[PDB]
């Protein structure tokens, strides 16, 4: 305390405003949230200890053996199909699955779930969307940048960092969004020309999307394209 008084250089913040409110949810919020999150995982850990001891080093001549360990699901979300899955390039524990609808004739809303290997009970992050999310991807350099594609060929971008959990970016008719769906979506590794996001539609136009301040610039890469009608 006397050393901080001696050397007043970068005075200690975290001012004691707190939450307060007397009763009906007092604080229960940011240092305590960490303690709650840690407690949850460590409670799970003790019940799954038998499976976790196997996962790390069970160690499972021309024969192979595959062992299923954990299943991550939700009873509300049993209607939707898994479609695309991806792993974060920074963190090998955190992976993202993007639940959407197949079979065309039946179409519902889709929720993107980012399951951590830490907590297998429910997702680390949820993301409600307007239609079924077909394709999901992570940007190799900054793993926060999350690339999303869903029906009506709308292209979404999310940040895991952001708390509000709304889309950072969206494609519109004015930004030349492709019709029908977006089956596959990938990040360009190069970061010289901002952040290049690649997408394909069933309409059959490979679209390169560049991130700008409160706008998305589209660029037609190639067209798929014979005695037929329309684009392949």
């Amino acid at each position: 305390a006397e050393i901080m008084k001696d050397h007043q250089i970068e005075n200690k913040k975290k001012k004691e405003v707190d939450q307060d409110k007397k009763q009906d949810q007092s604080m229960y919020s940011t240092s305590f949230k960490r303690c709650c999150k840690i407690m949850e995982r460590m409670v799970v850990q003790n019940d799954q200890e038998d499976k976790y001891h196997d996962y790390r080093y069970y160690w499972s001549k021309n024969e192979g053996h595959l062992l299923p360990i954990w299943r991550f699901s939700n009873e509300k979300q049993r209607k939707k199909n898994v479609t695309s899955i991806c792993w974060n390039p920074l963190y090998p524990d955190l992976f993202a699955v993007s639940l959407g609808s197949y079979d065309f004739t039946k179409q519902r809303m889709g929720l993107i779930c980012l399951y951590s290997l830490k907590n297998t009970t429910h997702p680390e992050y949820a993301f409600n969307c307007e239609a079924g999310v077909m394709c999901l991807d992570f940007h190799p350099k900054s793993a926060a940048l999350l690339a999303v594609g869903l029906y009506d060929g709308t292209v979404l971008v999310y940040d895991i960092r952001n708390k509000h959990k709304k889309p950072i970016y969206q494609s519109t008719v004015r930004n030349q969004k492709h019709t029908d769906p977006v089956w596959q979506v990938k990040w360009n590794p190069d970061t010289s020309k901002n952040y290049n996001f690649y997408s394909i539609s069933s309409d059959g136009r490979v679209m390169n999307w560049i991130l700008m301040k409160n706008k998305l610039e589209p660029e037609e890469v190639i067209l798929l394209r014979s005695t037929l009608i329309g684009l392949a």
Partner: protein
């Protein structure tokens, strides 16, 4: 052999790691606004004056 057992369990996963701990939103879309602070104008002039 009882401690070796407890070392193994904690070495499986970090369990305290926070995914994107500290680092903020970074790039965030900022819409270009123009707030009109105050209007000036003449009062009871013969015609209008540009």
């Amino acid at each position: 052999e009882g401690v070796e057992k407890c070392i193994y369990q904690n070495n499986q996963i970090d369990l305290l790691e926070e995914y994107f701990e500290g680092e903020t939103s970074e790039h965030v879309v900022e819409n270009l606004s123009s707030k009109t602070l105050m209007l000036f104008k003449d009062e009871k002039e013969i015609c209008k004056r540009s």
